Design a protein around this ligand. Sequence first.
Ligand SMILES: [Mg+2]
Ligand SMILES: [Zn+2]
Lengths: 66, 38, 94, 176, 130, 136
Amino acid sequence: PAAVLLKKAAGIKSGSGKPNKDKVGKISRAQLQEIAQTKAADMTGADIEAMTRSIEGTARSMGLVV
Amino acid sequence: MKVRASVKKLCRNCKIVKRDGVIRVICSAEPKHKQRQG
Amino acid sequence: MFTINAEVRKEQGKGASRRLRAANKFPAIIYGGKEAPLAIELDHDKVMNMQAKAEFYSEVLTIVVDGKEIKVKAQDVQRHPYKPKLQHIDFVRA
Amino acid sequence: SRVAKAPVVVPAGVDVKINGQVITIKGKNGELTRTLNDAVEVKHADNTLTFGPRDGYADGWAQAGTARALLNSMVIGVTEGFTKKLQLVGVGYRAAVKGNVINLSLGFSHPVDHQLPAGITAECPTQTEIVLKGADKQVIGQVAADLRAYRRPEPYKGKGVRYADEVVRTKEAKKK
Amino acid sequence: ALNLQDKQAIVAEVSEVAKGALSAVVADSRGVTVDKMTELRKAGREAGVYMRVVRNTLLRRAVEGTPFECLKDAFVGPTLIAYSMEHPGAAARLFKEFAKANAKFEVKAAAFEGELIPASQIDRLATLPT
Amino acid sequence: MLQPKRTKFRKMHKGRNRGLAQGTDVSFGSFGLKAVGRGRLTARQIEAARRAMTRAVKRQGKIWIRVFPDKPITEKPLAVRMGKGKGNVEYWVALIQPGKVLYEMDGVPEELAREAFKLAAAKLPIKTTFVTKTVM
RNA sequence: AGCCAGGAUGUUGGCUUAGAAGCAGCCAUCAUUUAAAGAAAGCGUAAUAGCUCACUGGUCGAGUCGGCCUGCGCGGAAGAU
Ligand SMILES: [Mg+2]
Ligand SMILES: [Zn+2]
């Protein structure tokens, strides 16, 4: 769902700081898009992109800048 | 109980009452917060 | 939007102004244009409530005295030295 | 409510004699009497009573509320009575019901016997769980406090007389 | 909520029934997010892409709000009766969705009934898609 | 600490503290701690209040001090008689009139400024109050 | 106002840290879901946890809410024939 498949961001669960800190993870254009698009089990609704954009934008705020 | 001049609320759970000639602060959970206006 | 009522000052001076302030109404002067200045007096609390908005100073207001509703501005305000009060608001015509 | 605005309803079988500021209630569960303050005028002209204070006082609404609450509690305790209970958490804490006298041997070299009011009954199925019943919840609470005053629940171990709904705490003494 | 949203609540209550408000009741325990997502998913996939299981319990909404159908809509107003309203149709499978959800640990208040559109008794009729 | 680098004269008369204050308007910031009473503020008290408000609010915001002692207050040592001259200068204080604005602050939340100025008042001897920016 | 119920996930995230996890202490408080989640306010847990609180809804039936101007009072207020 959003835990065991969200720990798969760049190779590690999460190892980055928000503004500019000890970051170990990055993000591509579809790496975290697929983990929310390919899954029709955890979706509250049908808008997959609605929760995909949130993860893509919070990758930067966690340390996985685009 | 802590007796002092100026009394207040340490945590929100503390209630202030006014008895015969004094003002007291009583906390239901933590006895340490018990205070009096001496 | 701002509409205030006024009265004409029967007596003017330090003693009259301080008596008015004790009576909870403060004086004011209206001048400008080519007409003689007029000494009015206003309720203090109404003006204090109205002056809170920035629009009171940045927009035209109207003052009504003896049935005449004249539109004026607010250029200078003298605040109380150490209290949330204003004394002798200044109104400029036109 | 705001001030004794919510009326009390008195069930049938509870005889009430109201005389000015003095009221008497007689039911199956004992008899009670109360003479009130000067902020009263409660009236009884229907199936129940609804309170009122006397005119000409800066106070009076709060007193009417207090009188209404007290009379409601007394009506409830005279029509059905109230009951409380105490639990003795600890080895050697023996409680015995000798009729109208309780015996409380709680780690004392000198055993202590306590008297009871004439309107209070008590019974203990064991030596640690005591249950008492009465008509007046004020007297019930007073006697319960008298019983519990012999020993308080110590936070460091958790022994001593306490109410059934009392919540004791055990934070830490020294880790040993 | 605020009066500006209370206005919209009544506007929706008197626009919901016009296009068909198939309604039901959801438990407070079944409305928990840990176990509400299943019902949300089921109802949404069955009906459309939008869902509304939000409860809007009111007494005056049973005299001037929800009731716009034939005669009976004021029996789901008081006594903790949750509101679950669905737009698409007055005879769709939304009743059957809650009937199925009943079998999976849902026995809360009123046997998932509301708006009495197809003269629905405690037992569902054959009108619903099977 | 706050003290003039040099002065024309080192000893000044006691003087008085009659009259109101000129700096009664908030100009260098958005919030101000305005003294509502009367008395004198020492450079030591000003430093204490500045440290208190610095602890209260972090690099988060700019703070201006609208006052400066400029008044040398002297005292005589212990076990000495009267006359024979004037004592050596001991410290520096200012004369504070009602309505005087002491500390101004900008770039901070309103509640944080309120708390910081309350803490500063707790250190200051003279009764003070909180004044917001004037629309005028 | 009481009462009832709800109040997830990455996340026990990554530096120091047998340990740091929402609480020696913190560097960092980000995001979707819903009416509701704040790297979580509290206690304490070595530390997790746990509940309430922030917030939301429902039962109960007309006053309540937190800011200013002030008046009179309250405690600070303990000495020796
Ligand atoms: Mg004079
Ligand atoms: Zn407390």
